[PDB]
């Protein structure tokens, strides 16, 4: 009796109000720099963080008080705030919403332009690659990054190479797990290389781990840095050179197979296109439509990837379903 | 055994991949004009809709095929598409994400400016009121609009007034339910008034329902149009004149009480600030922080609203919890 309208509405909205609010608070706070100071295991001290971020302290305090009202942080004492116990899961979920609604917003808002003159639209409406990187890392935290770590650590490698390694977090975490091991982080971006180069410094791995600043294409002609590696990792990278650079790509793959030490494998995480199964189909379709229609980059099915890795001379290929919908981890044994 | 990593990841992501993908597809499609042609009870014919929307048909077909892969539409025949059975619930959930991440995106991206010089930020970073209106209507579909309808229809009114009525859908639906009834839709926006004025035309209610183009403030001095109404409705409107126009507002409220026919009531849906209960607190906080910090509009608690309505001379005030988190429906009896 109008308690019906209420219960019916609650069931229809489900978790969407909570998620919409978490994602907006967390994107806003991350753009401010605040989210990197929130952690379930310690407090953020407003007086210091406001100074470190060059923000007015009363403004920062009203933000953290709003986030405290939302249940995302806990006010421990006066001027001190702690993230809620399940913050990292909430931030992981926010990553999916940030990626489709923020990182890829130029495609949402400008689809008509992309439909009528793609070449002009592709250069006019461009994605903010800081947002692409942050939301990808939030999604990866629980849905593909752990699986890649464990696989690399368990191979107990001596040399590990990462193509498109960014700030080299994955290499730093692997080297800190195999006490005797070396790493190579390859990235063609200047600022990415500069931050990876000092994060490795502050971990003391400045000798065990070098930060080469080249393209993955450059590997096709200079495969020297790949020599003798036990594991080569590429995360969501190889698709970005298809179909315009299929030969260069086929030849980087062939280079990787020859450069592998005995018993070594190339680990590729990438997205497969348009899955039909009920769990993955909806996010699969967004990942595929964004890549196929707006970025014009070719995503390959498992069948195509196995084909392509066989043709590069790998002797066996194992595909693993990742929790990230349409994410697959291909392990290509030499 | 690495089937653990998979099940753990799936539990951590929960419904977020599905929601993120639905919201992006549906905002993109709505901006294109396509979503208004999707319905669970009939098909969209691509050849005709592509022409009506001035879109290349192959482009429209790739979009609908992507949305079909996502499970949001069904391809009935060749060139014909039907929305999935629960489309309206999915679109309702997408409304929360659209509102926090799209409609209010100027606040997410520019919080630093709002913190350091508000007056300059408020006029530089402005919300797209087409996006505000669409996402509000998607949220309202299952979470506040039904409760307001049923209350108005059940009062069996002779005259109904709506302050900030937009395209007058709510009035059209009420007049089509009380066979003998009149309505007044008040809105100060030119284009809103022009569309309400022809939607009422195509319903034949062009006589029973007039579309006055004034401000709700203008009611404070010209209360004539309010005369004799059985029900006055205002949806998410009165807060937008607090605190800068408290006297004008207090006097519109007093005007409404005096203009009511005997047995009549004023129905106000509005948002209360920063609730603490577990269901509503997170979205409550986003609604409140957006209004308090970025729009500088005053949201009142239930206690304050009842106070304010008593002081305007209403004899009894009933507050109803809406499914929309922090939404409240206040019924103020004359
Ligand atoms: C994990 S995919 C994106 C990351 O990998 C880097 N990257 C993207 N494309 C390439 C490329 N062709 N070669 C080397 N690094 C790349 C980018 O600088 C970013 O850090
Ligand atoms: C339901 S809140 C927004 C809708 O109500 C209208 N509206 C907003 N503010 C006012 C106002 N002061 N007076 C009259 N209509 C308003 C807007 O034109 C829009 O259609
Ligand atoms: C995790 C990936 C899907 C990220 C990506 O492919 C991109 O945004 O470019
Ligand atoms: C449904 C309302 C919360 C919409 C609103 O207040 C706004 O965006 O201005
Ligand atoms: Zn990509
Ligand atoms: Zn508002």
Numbering used by the authors:
A (entry chain A), B (entry chain A): 6 to 339
Paper text:
SgvM is found in the biosynthetic gene cluster of the antibiotic viridogrisein and catalyzes methyl transfer to the C3 (i.e., β) position of α-ketoleucine (4-methyl-2-oxovalerate). The overall structure consists of a two-domain fold that assembles into homodimer in both the solution and the crystal. The N-terminal domain (I6 through H147) consists of helices that mediate dimerization, while the C-terminal domain (F149 through H338) consists of a Rossman fold. A single metal ion is located at the base of the C-terminal domain and is ligated by H244 and H296.
